[PDB]
């Protein structure tokens, strides 16, 4: 939480902050192995207007705490997933 600082933890973990003191980078060699709806409709319509199909639109709903939407769709033969909250 210091500005433009790099710091290394006891465990070897390296952290880098920006001018506002926000963490921007982390290094670890140690791993143990209107809004959203509008944002979504806007890009859909732009794809359609460019002559691209938006296929297989489905939603899963955890209902009524916010209602949770898991939205899915395919555009270039590629399925994308998105999460939207309603509260």
């Amino acid at each position: 939480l210091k500005a433009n600082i790099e710091y290394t933890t006891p465990t070897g973990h390296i952290y880098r902050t920006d001018h506002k003191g926000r963490i921007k980078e982390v290094y670890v060699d140690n791993l143990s192995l209107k809004g959203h709806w509008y944002n979504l409709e806007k890009e859909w319509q732009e794809f359609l207007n460019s002559g691209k199909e938006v296929k297989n639109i489905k939603m899963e709903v955890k209902y009524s705490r916010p209602t949770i939407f898991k939205v899915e769709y395919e555009i270039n033969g590629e399925r994308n997933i998105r999460r939207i909250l309603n509260k």
Binding site: Y15, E25, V28, G35, N39, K42, E43, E78, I81, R82
Partner: protein, 161 residues
């Protein structure tokens, strides 16, 4: 636990969740997450040893014997972990990140990149973000003109922030 010990716990939890969504042996995983209070997206690309080919995550049920329901339910848990990673910032009285790059290798190397761009009010869509991400991360150009132009709009937008 210190702040960095909590972050390490969830790094490990995110890494192992992704790894169990991959039904074959992988070498590297590039993960991108865009999350704010109203929702978000989490995608990743993985490589296999012997090849540099990128394998998109939702192609896993289309190519392997794993059900879309099981895959998506795992994705749901993975999202929750990233939201947990984000809440840790909130609890440290830190400004929460809006994007997290999460790259790791099977040997255990992990590199994380946080950013704080107000993406939702930028009004750029999910695929636009993903195409911009892919142009900067790897060398990948979109192939339609609308898509290419959208990446250019995002580049100029970010430089001028």
């Amino acid at each position: 636990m210190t702040f960095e010990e909590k972050l390490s716990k969830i790094y490990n939890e995110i890494a192992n969740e992704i790894s169990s969504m991959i039904p074959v042996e992988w070498e590297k995983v590039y993960t991108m997450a865009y999350i704010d209070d109203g929702g978000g997206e989490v995608f990743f690309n993985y490589t296999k040893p012997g090849s540099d080919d990128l394998n998109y995550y939702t192609n896993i049920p289309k190519e392997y014997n794993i059900s879309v329901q099981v895959f998506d339910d795992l994705w749901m848990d993975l999202y929750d972990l990233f939201e947990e990673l984000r809440d840790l910032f909130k609890e440290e009285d830190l400004e929460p990140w809006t994007s997290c790059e999460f790259d790791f290798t099977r040997e255990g190397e992990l590199k994380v990149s946080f950013d704080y761009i107000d993406w939702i009010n930028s009004e750029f869509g999910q695929i636009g973000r993903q195409n911009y991400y892919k142009y900067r991360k790897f060398g990948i150009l979109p192939e339609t003109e609308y898509e290419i132009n959208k990446v250019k709009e995002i580049e100029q937008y970010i430089k001028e922030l």
